[model samples]
Target: ADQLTEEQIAEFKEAFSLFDKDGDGTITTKELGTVMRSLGQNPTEAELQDMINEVDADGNGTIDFPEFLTMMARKMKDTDSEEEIREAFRVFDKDGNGYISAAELRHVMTNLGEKLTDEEVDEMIREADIDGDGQVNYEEFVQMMTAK
Candidate 1:
């Protein structure tokens, strides 16, 4: 067996993509911060710096996807399951609706400080709104997450 399953690789790849906000192939501090917020992870700039320190080989201070793979792959054995995803779902499930609709996703980035267009929001909802409910329940959220 290989050290990484295809599913796991894709997960980290998508994770990297999420962080590489501009898709520049490298993760900047701000980009990482933005994506981590979506996960409800508030790693400090100080903390985030060290995380980069550990992975930003070549002394560039940014994490290339190649390097990003190493750190997450190492964490592949940890028990950090869907708990993070759960909090993220809560962000979109505002007011205890127990579902994330276009309404929620359209505003998914108030924490992003307001820069996303509706198309982006629609894509997010489209990405996970299975069962044609025009929204994402926690179950669908998990499936879209794990299915990644």
Candidate 2:
């Protein structure tokens, strides 16, 4: 992954801090799971444990800021190219509202040569709606797409 600019780093830090519950200078699997739960996709305990084992550095039973940042960078690099992500953002900012509603996701999926079932779309909206407002803001939309 390329080096992140200071502003990008700061942005990442802010988002990561939101997930680092406990403020212990680290993120435990439980903490990460809480974030998922907030978005309505609660993983089983085993799944959470596996995620922590995969991402936690130093085997310290937690993901620190640097480790989390590295994981994010790698994920972003592996998922969408910059131009593609930008295009996605453009599409998601529908209704000229600068925000993405569940309807926007349905539209994007269709245009992308994929079709989502109502259940699938509902589930996705559940997983990505950060504000619990039944809609996705740019930050949530970007994170959800890149956090594959």
Candidate 3:
């Protein structure tokens, strides 16, 4: 993987916190599943099992925040280039506001052939808006993106 600068580390921390839902300091298989399903993809049971086995460092059958962060960092090495991450930030920032709003997110989801109810989309937007800013910045966007 390319070396991450200090800025990227901050971004990673924010993104990781956003995804560590339930505030249990860990990310469950279910959490990861939801993340993947949002992108119109699903992880196979075997794949999920493998992930748990590979990254559940505490041997507690789930991934803690640090473990999840490491998993994501590994994925960056395995699946994405720095340029790709930058491109993703650009594409998801539909409003060009340096952040992603619900309207922009809904438009993208709809374009991806997933028609979600307003309430459903709103909930999603809220989930990604970790800072309560009513919009998702690049940090949150990275956390929500499972395609990588």
Candidate 4:
């Protein structure tokens, strides 16, 4: 496993606590479903099973803090690179039209279990629609994500 910063360790502990419903120091599949629902996601039973299967290193059917940390680390590691960002943008650009439409943005957000209001979505488009074309091109998307 890679070394985590103190801040990363603290954040992971906090997230683990949310999923450790029983405070038993391990997260059950049921608890993961609950956590997902709490985040506004309605994951299917198969999805929950898949998640557990991926990270349950000991075949124990539950995720301990260390396993959870490892999973989080793997996910976080990929997002730090420019190539990763480009790939992410590609995923969000469902039509392969080289621009992210407002509809595409809303669809992806909803799939991620985030329920943004119409106005909020419009506002996001406004912020990133650099060309005033009502959609985000690749450069604009990169700028929006990477801007300080």
Query: lDDT tens string, model 4, 1-148?
Result: 3778889989999988877768889888788888679868798868788867777889786888888888788767756766878888889999786988888877887787879777777777787776788787788887665331
Candidate 3 lDDT by residue in tens digits, 1-148: 4556577667777766676678766667777777778867778756787768766787887776566567766676655665787676678677575877777777777787879777767777676667887676777776566422
**Which predicted model would earn the best TM-score?**
4
Candidates in descending TM-score order: 4, 2, 1, 3
**Top of the candidates by lDDT:** 4
Model 3 spans with C-alpha error above 4 angstroms: 1-4, 44-46, 81-148
Give the CA lDDT, 0 to 100, for residue 106 in model 3: 75
CA RMSD of each candidate after superposition:
15.1, 9.2, 13.3, 12.9
Q: After superposition, how far is residue 92 of candidate 1 from its true place, in Å?
A: 36
Model 4 C-alpha RMSD to native: 12.9
lDDT of candidates 1 onward, in order: 0.72, 0.73, 0.70, 0.79
Winner on TM-score (1 vs 4): 4
Off by over 4 Å in 2: 81-148
Error of 1 at 144 (Å): 32
Please list the residue runs of candidate 1 whose C-alpha ends up more than 4 Å from where it truly belongs after superposition: 82-148
- The TM-scores of all predictions, comma-separated, are 0.47, 0.48, 0.45, 0.52
lDDT of 1 by residue, 45-85 (tens): 77788768767768888888667767677556532576866
TM-score-best of 1 and 2: 2
